[PDB]
Symmetry: C4
Subunit: 173 residues, 4 copies
């Protein structure tokens, strides 16, 4: 847990995958051509906290949806990359647009397109529903599953590692 905290302490960008991370991985369709996606309410509040403690937020996702666009904006997530399977490339790109390198990125994913990004990121994170290969290259596995607070969980972990957890807690005490 020592080495976990170093990696997190130095994080400047938090980059999330969507399906399996911000959601439980359910891809929903109905009979009139409309897709649906479910997100988790405590995730948003934890992401609002990291936003405001200086850390910038991004989404890199293989699919493309209005739901993701819609959710990211209300959460103050700023960089929205959709229809991108090549995750490490996308991550590196942001690093150079924002002037902080790979060492300064956190990234969280559940599945194979994610592994290289979770491997090279300064702080790579997977979840219990992530395949075994992505988990093995991760610096941290969440207690919680995607769509059920894994994102909020790492949100707190980084805030703890940056010493902004107590300030964030005190705001609501």
């Amino acid at each position: 847990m020592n080495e976990i905290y170093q990696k997190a302490k130095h994080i400047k960008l938090f980059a999330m995958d969507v399906d399996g991370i911000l959601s439980d991985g359910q891809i929903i369709y109905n009979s009139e051509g409309t897709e649906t996606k479910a997100f988790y309410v405590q995730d948003g509040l934890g992401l609002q906290a990291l936003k405001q403690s200086g850390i910038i937020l991004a989404i890199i996702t293989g699919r493309s949806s209005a739901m993701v666009d819609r959710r990211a904006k209300e959460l103050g997530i700023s960089h929205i990359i959709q229809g991108q399977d090549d995750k490490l490339t996308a991550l590196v790109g942001l690093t150079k647009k924002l002037g902080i390198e790979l060492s300064h990125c956190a990234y969280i994913g559940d599945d194979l397109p994610d592994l290289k990004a979770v491997r090279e990121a300064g702080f790579g994170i997977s979840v219990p529903n992530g395949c075994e290969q992505t988990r093995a290259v991760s610096d941290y596995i969440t207690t919680k599953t995607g769509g059920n607070g894994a994102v909020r969980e790492v949100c707190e972990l980084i805030l703890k590692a940056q010493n902004n957890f107590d300030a964030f807690i005190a705001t609501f005490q």
Copy 2:
């Protein structure tokens, strides 16, 4: 048992958070622009019993939708405060608007905005899926999770504390 019963026994007003308490915390979006939210049937029954026992019911949530409006109104929940993250201030307002006292209020919530209100209501309640900071400040933690009968459970428990449970049960025999 009793250190928790006398807290519940002089409750006049029962106020609730929505997301994580009335629902399981899923924020559901779709590619048409429609939001969706799921509630639990047995919660309806519990609340109706509470209202019929003499208890005023309230909703204080930080989000805003028709769904909460629909649900509240079928359940005869008279005070519906939406779009409001500062729960304690809204709860005191009710206390004054209605001429009650914080001592006679029950507040249930699952996350940080709820902390002060859960803390300052005479009978504070949270849930297993709840924040550890919000839990550490509550007088009771439900066994059921939000959107799975946490609310019904606490309706049953308040009714017991008032000696109205057996009568309520008896209505259906």
Copy 3:
């Protein structure tokens, strides 16, 4: 409790279901366009059709009221659909007088207090792991599978086994 349950299920002619908490897991779902959604379980479908095919009359008795229930009820051959009814025991007896059969031959399943009297008086009353304590204490049988997750299928199989239609029912797919 083990072999007396066999006896009550063998003479069932009418099988009547609560919806929310029984056919569905009890999620009541609304959206911003004003639309209501409800979920049902696929294996319950197949179990109903099989009960129906063995000569059993099927009935829905629910306190809420929606098109989803009418839509589901149609596809499954459920002929008697009573919606917007909290007074279950009396709607059931109403069916039982309309079909001219007694409560002894009526199976009823419910999960909550409104279903209590019906589960109690029915010839064979069933509850679920997720029903309240009171309606359960009153059931002749409690399912292993939860509402919306097979509770109906499980009781269907049960009635067929107690009717020597089970092994014939499996045979059709063997």
Copy 4:
């Protein structure tokens, strides 16, 4: 662990039930007459993988919807058969039309309509949520449930049977 490794190995056709396998079995309806079905994101990648190793994919399903044909088209499943409970007929019908043996078909089912098709396929699979009889007639039962990575799991098993797994992982390392 074997029996299965040998029993798979010579699979050219992989055919799947939908309700209970690709989904968790919830049949979802709404008040505008709209029907919804959920699929699982990690199964998708699993299916592309098998399809990429040279294996032909098929759905055979008792019901019929836009959701299934949509999800099949995006996942490149080529043979989609709806409105058919006679799954052993249609699969045999597929084994002739395409020139494959049955011993080379793998088939996954969860309920009685799938019993025959599972039993007599070269490699027969069921899930934990499947009924007694269909499970007792299967060669392999997934650990993960229908609509939660059961399809993904067999996708990995087959690729590992055909010594094609490590190639797939490597693509992402």
